[model samples]
Target: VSDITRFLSVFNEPHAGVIQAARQQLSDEQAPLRQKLLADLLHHVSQNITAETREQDPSWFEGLESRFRNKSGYLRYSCESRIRGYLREVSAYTSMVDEAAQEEYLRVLGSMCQKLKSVQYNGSYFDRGAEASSRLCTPEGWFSCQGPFDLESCLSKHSINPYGNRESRILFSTWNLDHIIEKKRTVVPTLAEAIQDGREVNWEYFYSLLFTAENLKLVHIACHKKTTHKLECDRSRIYRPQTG
Candidate 1:
């Protein structure tokens, strides 16, 4: 938070607190409304991001969309910072409670993740195929294959933004990686928790946080690369001119 040039992908820590508070305030049956509302908001936000990007930059969107549609790999982004923060809020809120209203919420959230994962038209290098984790990539796969190479490599080879473009400098070092871990641990944000406790938990908030977390982490890995600035020229050519 103190430094802007740090790649810290974190969900909002206080977001967990808000969910817990809501749980304490409402009963199991009553929590579904909150979950539904939160899930709807999450879906809207994710969709709006893509829609807005398309409207603002069709060429960039088309490029990203094509990459996601064609490549087996992934991309990363910086806007994830805010998106992850809000996702944490929504996911944690959903975790507060669950019952009948839970099924639709999960369905909606899951669908949203699918859409994000399929995105090939993200507006920024920092926001590209980052959301592909939940939509397609698995946890084990993400950790080993998909995310931004290794932190050590990224630090050693890449410059500030190294995702093959000039903007990568800003995206690469926008937040502290530590903050991302801190936020994850704070909320117990996992897809497993949602499946197991769907009846007792608000899976909406939980999944939203995970979706964003996965994307942010992926972005961090890609931008940092195995060596800092190694991909600058390539990225620059691909990501020239703002996508959105």
Candidate 2:
């Protein structure tokens, strides 16, 4: 109804297909299904923005180097669609957030996407045959630390021998590919679960979310370690009171 139109408003002519697909899916779904879609999509939106979002690179804005500009635009648009889709749907049902706040959130979201795209050059090494190894290494460079640290900071310190001058450079060589959506929790259900009692599963919507590019990013290891250790240290500092 009106909700459908409002939801599709953020998209432009190029994204008509996405809007149509979303409309069809949301229209066919029940309220709860719609809500779950919003929740799952929002979860990714939440994760894509992190300390790395604040890392700025002016070169990304310099001249028309298609390599830099095109990829930056590509990532930004893709990220905007994913996050805005979730926001539009959520706003349709509730006024938990004001219009201004939503706008600010989108602004921040776009900024983060841009910052992440800015440093994507770090992946150029991986894009080339330049090589290294680690237990976390994957065909795509290295498995992302799925972080708790700033990717830019780690990259800035990429050449530093964090372990000391005598230690092997290998310690700082591997990079992290963070999964904006935690892979473990977002596991694709097996074929057995795809159908039950002869009814098909909601595979389309699930796959749409599962395969989003916004779900992945390249991060540096030192930053990841900082965030991880910081979280652990913070957890240890908190004490809980329980009464029996």
Candidate 3:
């Protein structure tokens, strides 16, 4: 924030009150059942983290430094980087193109890993992804590049930090959850017509522009944005109100 080796991306405007207080503390209402019970009790012992789990629990970095050390809580180290960022975003988004080239990607990687294991348990059900936009980092967990290649380039962006030393963790696994707009374009047909023919409901406005962090943009895949992209249905979120 106050000199992160650089600044800008936190969904614009000098961190708009830290992204509206983390989306009003995540629209505080629904209980994620104590937040999915300690992420299914540490997703069954996936072995400790670097420095032996902080030399064995310094309050496990105290529930992630008040949610990824603030200023937009990025790269907050969750569940082995969300299972290694879900196979590095499915082999860099199926390593090629979903541009209808006779469709490959192994038949859409088994329905994208079976509904993507409930979207990787929503990165522990409800917390957030890229562990909160990776704090727009550089305290040591460096990561930036919400596309500093065009249209203003996230205001002079591009960063990386795999904690340096340790082989920079497998040649610095570049970033990708860059869903700037294309998610099967129009975000899975507005969540499948907002749940089968319900023509009036919004469904949390398509789960915060379709899957939180106001639709992620952690794109450091060393120049992405090839697919293409670029929204509606809001009316008292009718649970069945359209009675004509």
Highest lDDT model number: 3
Write one digit per residue (lDDT tens) for candidate 1, span 1-244: 5674441222222334554544444444446778776543332222212222333434324435443321223234334444545444545545543555455555655665555556522223233343453332332112222334334334423222122222322333443332222234433433334444434344434433344443234333335333332211111221124445
Q: Could you list the CA RMSD of all candidates, in the order they appear?
A: 26.1, 24.9, 19.1
CA lDDT of each candidate? 0.37, 0.35, 0.43
Residues 1-244 of candidate 3 have per-residue lDDT tens digits of 4774443333233223554454444456447874454333222222122332333433334433443433112223343365445434444544344344214333434444444455552443212224444334443455666672234365547654443222333334456555554445655444454444535444444444434445656666655666555323343552346567
Clashes of each: 37, 4, 4
For model 3 the TM-score comes to 0.26
lDDT of 2 by residue, 44-104 (tens): 2222111111124332223323443332233334334444444344334223334444454
Deviation in Å, model 2, residue 126 alpha carbon:
3.3
Order of candidate numbers by lDDT, starting with the best: 3, 1, 2
- Per-model TM-score, in order, reads 0.24, 0.22, 0.26
Which residue window of length 10 is worst by lDDT in model 2?
160-169
Global Cα lDDT for candidate 1: 0.37
Off by over 4 Å in 1: 1-109, 115-159, 163-190, 198-201, 213-244
Best by TM-score: 3
1 versus 2: better lDDT goes to: 1
